[PDB]
Amino acid sequence: KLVIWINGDKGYNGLAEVGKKFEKDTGIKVTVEHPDKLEEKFPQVAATGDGPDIIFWAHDRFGGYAQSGLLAEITPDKAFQDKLYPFTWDAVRYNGKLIAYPIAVEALSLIYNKDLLPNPPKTWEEIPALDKELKAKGKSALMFNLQEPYFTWPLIAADGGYAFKYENGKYDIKDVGVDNAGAKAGLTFLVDLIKNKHMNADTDYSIAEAAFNKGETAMTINGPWAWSNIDTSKVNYGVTVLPTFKGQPSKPFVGVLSAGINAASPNKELAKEFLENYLLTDEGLEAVNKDKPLGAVALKSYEEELAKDPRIAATMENAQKGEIMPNIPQMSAFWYAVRTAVINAASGRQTVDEALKDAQTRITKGSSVPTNLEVVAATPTSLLISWDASYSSSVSYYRITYGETGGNSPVQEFTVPGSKSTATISGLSPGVDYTITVYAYSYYYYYYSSPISINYRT
């Protein structure tokens, strides 16, 4: 009666122990599975009404699922919500609804070699001089993956950068924080570190992991997935809060391991019972963690116990000071544009100011409204489609049209409320190529610049 999907690298046997205690009490059998590519197969099986009752995955994928209506809105009462860190609740919200239970929390931290650097710097500003001192021992102060905005963002955000403003339980996709004074300040500092020869523009993930793990550099910036390679290296390392910039914390993106209930589940009360009363408890998380460490957790009572490990407490401190990873598809524009901006600024192809201005422009440029239109499932006579709900408060309704590609027969259409992000097209024809267009209408009798279309062969 409860089928749960969780990745093969998590403590699925521990989860199954919690499930056998539930069965003890209810007589309901819990079945924990860990299929290959489970994050890809879930939406395929869930969309046709199948799939597990509960799925565990990083929250950033759950926005995609919630876009497609594949996750049940959950109903934890205020007392239950107060049991978890407030900010974890922000990671599981989509289009005005809570769509999963937060489980665990992941963020970058400062990792340091305790033999080379027993007292790591609290500020980014102190790094040039620490590097000068360490170069003289033929070492360096810091190496990390400069190639990727995920790893450089925490410095660029410190002084005021942000991806998309998050304000009332929602992202404002028009308010983007890439070319502001703060972002420019962080990026200039990083580029000065390179110009002044404390870092190399070409350092990537392996080059930094090798240097740290060989004892060649005193610090790196990395996440809890890196620790076991360090354990095996025999560097005596610590994990601490990221340095401050201009007196403000570095702000790493936060990934929250979450548990959603399948919208098609006939067991949703069962799932809530299991998730609220068995799994999100000291005893339940202990059972999973004892099998495979969950890292830092959303549940305050048990985080308080795990925090005896300074590395876990560091993950949570850095997470609380960081910014939940947006669960919206506009993030792909962000990564493309910021990735280019940092590479150009670091190589001196562009100045920091022009690089970030171009990145900002690229992210906020006119595009599809809605965006992210997709076929979620198909049969030979029907399609289930979905689109991003980011503009729902500005949209009165969506007008959806569809017809064979290239053809002149009467276009078929219908509408759906502006709070919606899914539709079913049916009465279709096997093997036929169809064009599907979605127009987003405002409250004032016009559609927003740029309806979106896709083709799909039935």
UniProtKB/Swiss-Prot annotation:
GO CC terms of this entry: ATP-binding cassette (ABC) transporter complex; ATP-binding cassette (ABC) transporter complex, substrate-binding subunit-containing; maltose transport complex; membrane; outer membrane-bounded periplasmic space; periplasmic space
Record text on subunit structure and interactions: The complex is composed of two ATP-binding proteins (MalK), two transmembrane proteins (MalG and MalF) and a solute-binding protein (MalE).
GO BP: any one term: DNA damage response
Stated role: Part of the ABC transporter complex MalEFGK involved in maltose/maltodextrin import. Binds maltose and higher maltodextrins such as maltotriose.
Protein name, UniProt field: Maltose/maltodextrin-binding periplasmic protein
Upper lineage: Bacteria, Pseudomonadati, Pseudomonadota, Gammaproteobacteria, Enterobacterales
Keyword Disulfide bond among UniProt keywords: no
Gene3D superfamilies assigned: Periplasmic binding protein-like II (3.40.190.10)
Originating gene: malE
Keyword terms, alphabetized: Periplasm, Signal, Sugar transport, Transport
One Pfam family recorded for the sequence: SBP_bac_1
Localization of this protein: Periplasm
Induction, as annotated: Induced by maltose and the transcriptional regulator MalT. Permanently repressed by cold shock in a PNPase-dependent fashion.
Domain of life: Bacteria
